[PDB]
Amino acid sequence: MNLTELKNTPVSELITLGENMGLENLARMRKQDIIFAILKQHAKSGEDIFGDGVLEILQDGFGFLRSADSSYLAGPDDIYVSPSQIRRFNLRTGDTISGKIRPPKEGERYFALLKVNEVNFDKPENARNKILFENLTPLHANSRLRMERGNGSTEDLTARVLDLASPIGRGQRGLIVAPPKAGKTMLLQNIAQSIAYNHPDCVLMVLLIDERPEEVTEMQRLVKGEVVASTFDEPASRHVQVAEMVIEKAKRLVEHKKDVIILLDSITRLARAYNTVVPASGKVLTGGVDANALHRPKRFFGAARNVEEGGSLTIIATALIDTGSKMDEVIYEEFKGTGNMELHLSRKIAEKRVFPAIDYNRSGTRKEELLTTQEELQKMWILRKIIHPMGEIDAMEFLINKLAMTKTNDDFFEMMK
Protein backbone atom coordinates (compact mmCIF):
# COMPACT_ATOMS: atom_id res chain seq x y z
CA MET A 1 0.00 0.00 0.00
CA ASN A 2 2.04 2.91 -1.36
CA LEU A 3 0.79 6.33 -2.47
CA THR A 4 2.94 6.55 -5.61
CA GLU A 5 1.86 3.06 -6.69
CA LEU A 6 -1.80 4.09 -6.59
CA LYS A 7 -0.92 7.37 -8.32
CA ASN A 8 0.75 5.52 -11.21
CA THR A 9 -2.26 3.23 -11.72
CA PRO A 10 -4.74 4.29 -14.43
CA VAL A 11 -8.21 5.64 -13.76
CA SER A 12 -10.10 2.62 -15.11
CA GLU A 13 -8.38 0.09 -12.84
CA LEU A 14 -8.87 2.33 -9.80
CA ILE A 15 -12.57 2.72 -10.61
CA THR A 16 -12.88 -1.06 -11.00
CA LEU A 17 -11.09 -1.68 -7.69
CA GLY A 18 -13.29 0.86 -5.91
CA GLU A 19 -16.45 -0.69 -7.32
CA ASN A 20 -15.23 -4.12 -6.19
CA MET A 21 -14.57 -2.76 -2.70
CA GLY A 22 -18.22 -1.70 -2.51
CA LEU A 23 -18.19 2.09 -2.19
CA GLU A 24 -20.01 5.03 -3.76
CA ASN A 25 -20.03 5.40 -7.54
CA LEU A 26 -16.47 6.32 -8.54
CA ALA A 27 -17.18 7.07 -12.21
CA ARG A 28 -18.27 10.62 -11.33
CA MET A 29 -15.34 11.10 -8.94
CA ARG A 30 -11.82 12.49 -9.08
CA LYS A 31 -8.87 10.09 -9.15
CA GLN A 32 -7.49 11.58 -5.93
CA ASP A 33 -10.86 11.11 -4.21
CA ILE A 34 -10.96 7.52 -5.52
CA ILE A 35 -7.51 6.85 -4.06
CA PHE A 36 -8.55 8.47 -0.77
CA ALA A 37 -11.68 6.32 -0.52
CA ILE A 38 -9.71 3.17 -1.39
CA LEU A 39 -7.16 3.98 1.32
CA LYS A 40 -9.96 4.59 3.84
CA GLN A 41 -11.66 1.29 2.98
CA HIS A 42 -8.36 -0.60 3.14
CA ALA A 43 -7.47 0.92 6.52
CA LYS A 44 -10.92 0.06 7.91
CA SER A 45 -9.87 -3.59 7.54
CA GLY A 46 -6.86 -3.01 9.81
CA GLU A 47 -4.07 -3.04 7.22
CA ASP A 48 -1.27 -0.48 7.21
CA ILE A 49 -0.79 2.32 4.67
CA PHE A 50 2.56 3.72 3.56
CA GLY A 51 3.45 6.99 1.86
CA ASP A 52 6.37 9.22 0.93
CA GLY A 53 7.19 12.73 -0.22
CA VAL A 54 9.37 15.77 0.25
CA LEU A 55 8.93 17.64 3.52
CA GLU A 56 7.80 21.30 3.46
CA ILE A 57 7.96 22.76 6.96
CA LEU A 58 5.52 25.64 7.38
CA GLN A 59 6.18 28.82 9.33
CA ASP A 60 3.94 27.74 12.22
CA GLY A 61 5.91 24.55 12.87
CA PHE A 62 4.03 21.77 11.08
CA GLY A 63 4.54 20.55 7.52
CA PHE A 64 3.37 18.37 4.66
CA LEU A 65 4.86 15.80 2.28
CA ARG A 66 4.57 17.22 -1.23
CA SER A 67 4.52 14.98 -4.30
CA ALA A 68 6.81 15.26 -7.31
CA ASP A 69 4.18 14.41 -9.94
CA SER A 70 2.22 17.57 -9.03
CA SER A 71 5.24 19.93 -9.06
CA TYR A 72 5.07 20.24 -5.26
CA LEU A 73 1.57 21.70 -5.36
CA ALA A 74 -0.72 21.75 -2.33
CA GLY A 75 -2.83 18.61 -2.60
CA PRO A 76 -5.54 17.04 -0.45
CA ASP A 77 -3.48 13.82 -0.13
CA ASP A 78 -0.57 15.53 1.64
CA ILE A 79 0.73 13.75 4.73
CA TYR A 80 0.61 15.90 7.86
CA VAL A 81 3.84 15.98 9.88
CA SER A 82 3.46 17.03 13.50
CA PRO A 83 6.08 19.44 14.90
CA SER A 84 6.77 16.97 17.72
CA GLN A 85 8.28 14.46 15.29
CA ILE A 86 10.14 17.30 13.55
CA ARG A 87 11.66 18.30 16.94
CA ARG A 88 12.36 14.58 17.76
CA PHE A 89 14.18 13.76 14.49
CA ASN A 90 15.51 17.26 13.61
CA LEU A 91 13.69 17.30 10.29
CA ARG A 92 14.10 20.20 7.86
CA THR A 93 12.59 21.30 4.56
CA GLY A 94 13.72 18.90 1.84
CA ASP A 95 14.17 15.70 3.87
CA THR A 96 12.62 12.74 2.05
CA ILE A 97 10.42 10.90 4.55
CA SER A 98 8.87 7.47 3.95
CA GLY A 99 6.82 5.85 6.70
CA LYS A 100 3.49 4.44 7.75
CA ILE A 101 0.48 6.75 7.40
CA ARG A 102 -3.15 6.64 8.50
CA PRO A 103 -6.32 8.18 7.03
CA PRO A 104 -7.65 11.31 8.76
CA LYS A 105 -10.10 10.72 11.60
CA GLU A 106 -13.21 12.77 12.36
CA GLY A 107 -12.18 16.42 12.32
CA GLU A 108 -8.97 15.91 10.33
CA ARG A 109 -8.21 16.60 6.68
CA TYR A 110 -4.78 15.05 6.03
CA PHE A 111 -2.93 11.80 6.66
CA ALA A 112 -0.87 11.55 9.85
CA LEU A 113 2.63 10.11 10.23
CA LEU A 114 3.08 7.42 12.89
CA LYS A 115 6.56 5.94 12.35
CA VAL A 116 9.27 7.05 9.91
CA ASN A 117 11.03 4.16 8.18
CA GLU A 118 13.53 5.79 5.79
CA VAL A 119 15.03 9.29 5.73
CA ASN A 120 16.61 10.66 2.54
CA PHE A 121 16.65 7.13 1.07
CA ASP A 122 18.88 6.05 3.96
CA LYS A 123 18.74 4.92 7.57
CA PRO A 124 17.77 7.56 10.16
CA GLU A 125 20.90 6.65 12.14
CA ASN A 126 22.98 8.00 9.24
CA ALA A 127 20.83 11.14 8.87
CA ARG A 128 20.81 12.11 12.55
CA ASN A 129 24.59 12.71 12.33
CA LYS A 130 25.36 14.85 9.28
CA ILE A 131 27.19 18.02 8.27
CA LEU A 132 25.09 20.96 7.08
CA PHE A 133 25.41 22.23 3.52
CA GLU A 134 26.52 25.67 4.76
CA ASN A 135 29.64 24.12 6.34
CA LEU A 136 30.91 22.11 3.36
CA THR A 137 34.17 23.38 1.89
CA PRO A 138 33.66 24.63 -1.70
CA LEU A 139 36.05 23.71 -4.49
CA HIS A 140 36.47 24.14 -8.22
CA ALA A 141 35.24 21.67 -10.83
CA ASN A 142 37.52 18.62 -10.60
CA SER A 143 35.64 15.73 -12.22
CA ARG A 144 35.04 16.00 -15.97
CA LEU A 145 31.42 15.65 -17.11
CA ARG A 146 31.95 14.92 -20.79
CA MET A 147 28.91 15.70 -22.93
CA GLU A 148 30.02 13.94 -26.13
CA ARG A 149 27.79 11.01 -27.09
CA GLY A 150 30.36 9.03 -29.07
CA ASN A 151 27.78 7.15 -31.16
CA GLY A 152 28.54 9.20 -34.28
CA SER A 153 25.02 10.61 -34.48
CA THR A 154 24.23 13.80 -36.38
CA GLU A 155 22.87 15.39 -33.19
CA ASP A 156 26.23 14.84 -31.46
CA LEU A 157 27.60 17.89 -33.29
CA THR A 158 26.00 20.18 -30.70
CA ALA A 159 27.60 18.26 -27.83
CA ARG A 160 30.97 18.28 -29.62
CA VAL A 161 30.80 22.05 -30.15
CA LEU A 162 29.79 22.51 -26.50
CA ASP A 163 32.76 20.42 -25.35
CA LEU A 164 35.13 22.36 -27.61
CA ALA A 165 33.73 25.69 -26.40
CA SER A 166 33.03 25.16 -22.68
CA PRO A 167 33.61 21.81 -20.95
CA ILE A 168 31.33 21.23 -17.97
CA GLY A 169 32.38 19.60 -14.71
CA ARG A 170 30.80 18.71 -11.38
CA GLY A 171 29.83 21.76 -9.35
CA GLN A 172 29.92 24.14 -12.31
CA ARG A 173 27.89 27.37 -12.12
CA GLY A 174 27.36 28.58 -15.68
CA LEU A 175 25.01 30.74 -17.73
CA ILE A 176 23.42 30.21 -21.15
CA VAL A 177 23.04 33.75 -22.50
CA ALA A 178 20.90 33.89 -25.64
CA PRO A 179 18.32 36.25 -27.15
CA PRO A 180 14.81 34.89 -27.77
CA LYS A 181 14.10 32.72 -30.82
CA ALA A 182 17.69 31.40 -30.86
CA GLY A 183 17.25 27.69 -30.15
CA LYS A 184 17.46 27.47 -26.36
CA THR A 185 14.83 24.72 -26.24
CA MET A 186 16.64 22.33 -28.60
CA LEU A 187 19.98 23.10 -26.92
CA LEU A 188 18.57 22.34 -23.46
CA GLN A 189 16.97 19.13 -24.77
CA ASN A 190 20.29 18.02 -26.26
CA ILE A 191 22.13 18.85 -23.03
CA ALA A 192 19.62 16.89 -20.95
CA GLN A 193 19.74 13.89 -23.30
CA SER A 194 23.55 13.89 -23.30
CA ILE A 195 23.61 14.08 -19.49
CA ALA A 196 21.12 11.21 -19.19
CA TYR A 197 23.08 9.12 -21.71
CA ASN A 198 26.68 9.72 -20.61
CA HIS A 199 26.14 10.11 -16.84
CA PRO A 200 22.99 8.22 -15.82
CA ASP A 201 24.12 8.05 -12.18
CA CYS A 202 23.69 11.79 -11.58
CA VAL A 203 20.37 13.15 -10.33
CA LEU A 204 18.98 15.32 -13.15
CA MET A 205 16.38 17.97 -12.27
CA VAL A 206 14.90 20.30 -14.90
CA LEU A 207 13.20 23.43 -13.54
CA LEU A 208 10.89 25.31 -15.92
CA ILE A 209 9.27 28.37 -14.31
CA ASP A 210 6.72 30.53 -16.16
CA GLU A 211 6.82 28.53 -19.42
CA ARG A 212 4.23 27.43 -22.03
CA PRO A 213 2.57 24.16 -20.78
CA GLU A 214 2.93 22.42 -24.17
CA GLU A 215 6.68 22.89 -23.63
CA VAL A 216 6.29 21.49 -20.10
CA THR A 217 4.57 18.30 -21.25
CA GLU A 218 7.08 18.05 -24.10
CA MET A 219 10.09 18.23 -21.77
CA GLN A 220 8.43 15.81 -19.34
CA ARG A 221 8.01 13.17 -22.07
CA LEU A 222 11.45 13.73 -23.66
CA VAL A 223 14.15 13.74 -20.96
CA LYS A 224 15.00 10.75 -18.77
CA GLY A 225 14.72 12.34 -15.37
CA GLU A 226 12.64 14.44 -13.01
CA VAL A 227 10.78 17.47 -14.37
CA VAL A 228 9.40 20.07 -11.95
CA ALA A 229 7.73 22.95 -13.78
CA SER A 230 5.31 25.81 -13.11
CA THR A 231 3.40 27.31 -16.04
CA PHE A 232 2.62 31.01 -16.39
CA ASP A 233 -0.97 30.40 -15.25
CA GLU A 234 0.34 30.19 -11.67
CA PRO A 235 1.23 33.22 -9.54
CA ALA A 236 4.79 34.16 -8.65
CA SER A 237 4.23 32.79 -5.13
CA ARG A 238 4.06 29.24 -6.48
CA HIS A 239 7.20 29.96 -8.52
CA VAL A 240 9.07 31.03 -5.38
CA GLN A 241 7.75 28.02 -3.46
CA VAL A 242 8.82 25.58 -6.19
CA ALA A 243 12.27 27.16 -6.43
CA GLU A 244 12.72 26.95 -2.65
CA MET A 245 11.58 23.32 -2.53
CA VAL A 246 13.88 22.35 -5.41
CA ILE A 247 16.93 24.07 -3.94
CA GLU A 248 16.24 22.59 -0.49
CA LYS A 249 15.92 19.09 -1.94
CA ALA A 250 19.15 19.65 -3.88
CA LYS A 251 20.95 20.74 -0.70
CA ARG A 252 19.61 17.75 1.25
CA LEU A 253 20.76 15.41 -1.52
CA VAL A 254 24.23 16.99 -1.69
CA GLU A 255 24.48 16.60 2.09
CA HIS A 256 24.32 12.82 1.47
CA LYS A 257 27.18 12.96 -1.09
CA LYS A 258 24.94 12.95 -4.17
CA ASP A 259 25.61 14.53 -7.57
CA VAL A 260 22.70 16.89 -8.27
CA ILE A 261 22.29 18.60 -11.65
CA ILE A 262 19.81 21.47 -12.04
CA LEU A 263 19.03 22.72 -15.56
CA LEU A 264 17.35 26.08 -14.96
CA ASP A 265 15.68 27.79 -17.93
CA SER A 266 14.01 30.73 -16.18
CA ILE A 267 16.60 32.62 -14.07
CA THR A 268 15.20 35.83 -15.56
CA ARG A 269 11.63 34.71 -14.88
CA LEU A 270 12.63 33.69 -11.36
CA ALA A 271 14.14 37.13 -10.75
CA ARG A 272 10.96 38.73 -12.09
CA ALA A 273 8.87 36.58 -9.73
CA TYR A 274 11.05 37.55 -6.76
CA ASN A 275 10.81 41.22 -7.72
CA THR A 276 7.02 40.84 -7.91
CA VAL A 277 6.61 39.06 -4.54
CA VAL A 278 8.89 41.46 -2.62
CA PRO A 279 7.02 44.24 -0.76
CA ALA A 280 7.51 47.74 -2.12
CA SER A 281 10.06 49.81 -0.19
CA GLY A 282 9.58 53.13 -1.98
CA LYS A 283 12.95 52.84 -3.74
CA VAL A 284 13.12 51.66 -7.36
CA LEU A 285 16.38 51.31 -9.28
CA THR A 286 16.98 51.76 -13.00
CA GLY A 287 14.74 49.47 -15.04
CA GLY A 288 12.20 48.69 -12.32
CA VAL A 289 14.32 46.42 -10.11
CA ASP A 290 14.02 46.53 -6.33
CA ALA A 291 17.17 46.87 -4.24
CA ASN A 292 16.44 43.67 -2.28
CA ALA A 293 14.78 41.68 -5.09
CA LEU A 294 17.92 40.14 -6.61
CA HIS A 295 19.21 38.77 -3.28
CA ARG A 296 17.11 35.60 -3.36
CA PRO A 297 18.03 34.71 -6.99
CA LYS A 298 21.63 35.58 -6.12
CA ARG A 299 21.62 33.01 -3.31
CA PHE A 300 19.76 30.46 -5.45
CA PHE A 301 22.47 30.80 -8.10
CA GLY A 302 25.37 30.78 -5.65
CA ALA A 303 24.06 27.64 -3.95
CA ALA A 304 25.84 25.65 -6.67
CA ARG A 305 29.25 24.48 -5.47
CA ASN A 306 31.58 21.48 -5.51
CA VAL A 307 31.99 19.64 -2.21
CA GLU A 308 35.32 18.09 -1.24
CA GLU A 309 33.81 15.61 1.24
CA GLY A 310 31.50 14.24 -1.46
CA GLY A 311 28.86 15.16 -4.02
CA SER A 312 28.39 18.28 -6.10
CA LEU A 313 25.70 20.73 -7.23
CA THR A 314 25.58 21.95 -10.84
CA ILE A 315 23.24 24.76 -11.88
CA ILE A 316 23.02 25.75 -15.56
CA ALA A 317 20.70 28.75 -15.93
CA THR A 318 19.65 30.30 -19.25
CA ALA A 319 19.48 34.09 -19.12
CA LEU A 320 17.35 36.20 -21.46
CA ILE A 321 18.72 39.27 -23.26
CA ASP A 322 17.42 41.64 -25.94
CA THR A 323 13.85 41.04 -24.78
CA GLY A 324 12.89 44.73 -25.05
CA SER A 325 12.62 45.14 -21.26
CA LYS A 326 15.31 47.07 -19.39
CA MET A 327 14.62 45.03 -16.24
CA ASP A 328 15.86 41.83 -17.88
CA GLU A 329 18.91 43.71 -19.18
CA VAL A 330 19.74 44.92 -15.66
CA ILE A 331 19.24 41.40 -14.30
CA TYR A 332 21.22 39.49 -16.93
CA GLU A 333 24.51 41.34 -16.47
CA GLU A 334 24.01 41.93 -12.70
CA PHE A 335 24.26 38.14 -12.98
CA LYS A 336 27.02 38.33 -15.62
CA GLY A 337 29.72 38.91 -12.99
CA THR A 338 28.38 35.54 -11.71
CA GLY A 339 28.15 32.30 -13.80
CA ASN A 340 31.76 30.98 -13.92
CA MET A 341 30.86 30.12 -17.55
CA GLU A 342 29.11 31.99 -20.36
CA LEU A 343 27.81 30.24 -23.49
CA HIS A 344 26.56 33.01 -25.77
CA LEU A 345 24.27 32.34 -28.73
CA SER A 346 24.07 34.65 -31.74
CA ARG A 347 20.72 35.65 -33.24
CA LYS A 348 22.39 36.52 -36.56
CA ILE A 349 23.61 32.94 -36.92
CA ALA A 350 20.20 31.56 -35.90
CA GLU A 351 18.51 33.65 -38.60
CA LYS A 352 20.70 31.91 -41.20
CA ARG A 353 19.31 28.53 -40.02
CA VAL A 354 22.80 27.40 -38.97
CA PHE A 355 22.29 25.10 -35.99
CA PRO A 356 23.76 25.26 -33.50
CA ALA A 357 24.09 29.06 -33.39
CA ILE A 358 26.80 29.30 -30.73
CA ASP A 359 29.07 32.32 -30.29
CA TYR A 360 32.39 30.49 -29.99
CA ASN A 361 34.36 33.71 -29.55
CA ARG A 362 32.70 34.97 -26.36
CA SER A 363 32.30 31.47 -24.91
CA GLY A 364 34.83 29.94 -22.55
CA THR A 365 35.45 28.39 -19.15
CA ARG A 366 37.68 29.58 -16.33
CA LYS A 367 40.22 27.12 -14.89
CA GLU A 368 39.63 24.82 -17.86
CA GLU A 369 43.00 23.13 -17.27
CA LEU A 370 41.47 21.27 -14.31
CA LEU A 371 39.08 19.37 -16.61
CA THR A 372 41.27 18.74 -19.69
CA THR A 373 44.71 17.28 -20.29
CA GLN A 374 47.76 19.23 -21.44
CA GLU A 375 47.58 18.20 -25.10
CA GLU A 376 43.81 18.70 -25.17
CA LEU A 377 44.18 22.19 -23.71
CA GLN A 378 46.90 23.02 -26.24
CA LYS A 379 44.72 21.80 -29.11
CA MET A 380 41.78 23.85 -27.83
CA TRP A 381 44.03 26.92 -27.57
CA ILE A 382 45.25 26.41 -31.14
CA LEU A 383 41.68 25.96 -32.37
CA ARG A 384 40.62 29.17 -30.61
CA LYS A 385 43.57 31.09 -32.05
CA ILE A 386 42.66 29.84 -35.54
CA ILE A 387 38.93 30.55 -35.14
CA HIS A 388 39.31 34.03 -33.58
CA PRO A 389 40.33 35.92 -36.78
CA MET A 390 37.41 34.52 -38.79
CA GLY A 391 33.91 35.92 -38.46
CA GLU A 392 31.22 34.30 -36.36
CA ILE A 393 29.19 32.82 -39.22
CA ASP A 394 32.33 31.84 -41.13
CA ALA A 395 33.86 30.20 -38.05
CA MET A 396 30.64 28.29 -37.38
CA GLU A 397 30.46 27.08 -40.99
CA PHE A 398 34.13 26.03 -40.86
CA LEU A 399 33.63 24.16 -37.58
CA ILE A 400 30.52 22.38 -38.88
CA ASN A 401 32.20 21.38 -42.16
CA LYS A 402 35.25 20.10 -40.28
CA LEU A 403 33.27 18.16 -37.66
CA ALA A 404 31.03 16.58 -40.31
CA MET A 405 34.06 14.84 -41.85
CA THR A 406 34.85 12.74 -38.76
CA LYS A 407 33.04 11.28 -35.76
CA THR A 408 35.39 12.23 -32.90
CA ASN A 409 37.07 15.55 -32.21
CA ASP A 410 40.42 13.80 -31.68
CA ASP A 411 40.63 13.02 -35.41
CA PHE A 412 39.85 16.67 -36.20
CA PHE A 413 42.58 17.86 -33.83
CA GLU A 414 45.04 15.38 -35.35
CA MET A 415 44.18 16.53 -38.88
CA MET A 416 44.52 20.21 -37.95
CA LYS A 417 48.23 19.71 -37.23
Ligand X SMILES: Nc1ncnc2c1ncn2[C@@H]1O[C@H](COP(=O)(O)OP(=O)(O)O)[C@@H](O)[C@H]1O
Work out which of 180, 235, 288, 391 binds ligand BEF, going by CB under 6 A.
180
- Taking the complex as a whole, the smallest distance from the CB of residue 174 to ligand BEF amounts, in Å, to 13
Q: Does 61 bind RNA (CB under 7 A)?
A: no
Q: Which does 351 bind (CB under 5 to 8 A by kind): RNA, ligand X, a second copy, none?
A: a second copy
Could you give the CA distance from residue 96 to residue 65 in angstroms, rounded to a whole number? 8
Could you give the CA distance from residue 371 to residue 247 in angstroms, rounded to a whole number? 26
Q: Does 285 bind RNA (CB under 7 A)?
A: yes
Q: Of 104 and 179, which CB lies nearer to ligand X in the complex structure?
A: 179
Piece of 179-187, 217-225, 278-286, 404-412 that binds ligand X (CB under 6 A): 179-187
Q: Of 34 and 216, which CB lies nearer to Mg ion in the complex structure?
A: 216
Work out which of 152, 282, 337, 389 binds RNA, going by CB under 7 A.
282
Piece of 12-20, 180-188, 199-207, 245-253 that binds ligand X (CB under 6 A): 180-188
Work out which of 105, 109, 115, 283 binds a second copy, going by CB under 8 A.
283
Q: 207 - beta bridge partners?
A: 228, 264
Per-residue burial over 371-405, b = 16 or more CB atoms within 10 Å of its CB, e = otherwise: bbeeebeebbeebeeebeeeebeebbeebeeebee
Q: Which does 286 bind (CB under 5 to 8 A by kind): Mg ion, RNA, ligand X, none?
A: RNA
CB atoms inside a 10 Å sphere around CB 192: 21
- Taking the complex as a whole, the smallest distance from the CB of residue 264 to ligand BEF amounts, in Å, to 13
Residues of this chain, 4-43, that bind a second copy according to CB under 8 A: 28
Q: Does 232 bind a second copy (CB under 8 A)?
A: yes
Q: Of 271 and 349, which CB lies nearer to ligand X in the complex structure?
A: 349
Piece of 42-50, 136-144, 243-251, 402-410 that binds a second copy (CB under 8 A): 136-144
Residues of this chain, 322-381, that bind RNA according to CB under 7 A: 326-327, 329
- Taking the complex as a whole, the smallest distance from the CB of residue 185 to Mg ion amounts, in Å, to 5
Piece of 16-24, 26-34, 165-173, 175-183 that binds ligand X (CB under 6 A): 175-183
- Taking the complex as a whole, the smallest distance from the CB of residue 212 to a second copy amounts, in Å, to 6
Q: Of 333 and 351, which CB lies nearer to RNA in the complex structure?
A: 333
Exposure of 44 by Cβ count < 10 A (0-12 exposed, 13-18 middle, 19+ buried)? Answer: exposed
Helix H, strand E, coil C: the string for the chain is: CEHHHHHHCCHHHHHHHHHHHCCCCCCCCCHHHHHHHHHHHHHHCCCCEEEEEEEEECCCCCEEEECCCCCCCCCCCCEEECHHHHHHHCCCCCCEEEEEEECCCCCCCCEEEEEEEEECCECHHHHCCCCCHHHCCEECCCCEECCCCCCCCCCHHHHHHHHHHCCEECCCEEEEEECCCCCHHHHHHHHHHHHHHHCCCCEEEEEEEEECHHHHHHHHCCCCCEEEEEECCCCHHHHHHHHHHHHHHHHHHHCCCCEEEEEECCHHHHHHHHHHHCCCCCCECCCCCECCCCHHHHHHHHCCCEECCCCEEEEEEEEECCCCCHHHHHHHHHCCCCCCEECCECHHHHHCCCCCCECCCCCEECCHHHCCCHHHHHHHHHHHHHHCCCCHHHHHHHHHHHHCCCCCHHHHHHHHC
Piece of 25-33, 177-185, 186-194, 354-362 that binds ligand BEF (CB under 6 A): 177-185
Q: Does 367 bind ligand X (CB under 6 A)?
A: yes
Site pattern 149..168 for ligand X (x: CB under 6 A) = ---------x----------
Residues of this chain, 29-88, that bind ligand BEF according to CB under 6 A: none
Residues that bind ligand BEF (CB under 6 A): 180-181, 184-185, 320, 337
Report the interface residues with RNA, using CB under 7 A: 282-288, 326-327, 329
Residues that bind a second copy (CB under 8 A): 28, 129, 134, 137-140, 171, 173, 180-181, 185, 212-218, 231-233, 275-276, 280-292, 298-299, 302, 305-306, 320, 323-327, 329-330, 332-337, 340, 342, 351-353, 361-362, 364, 366, 381, 384-385, 388
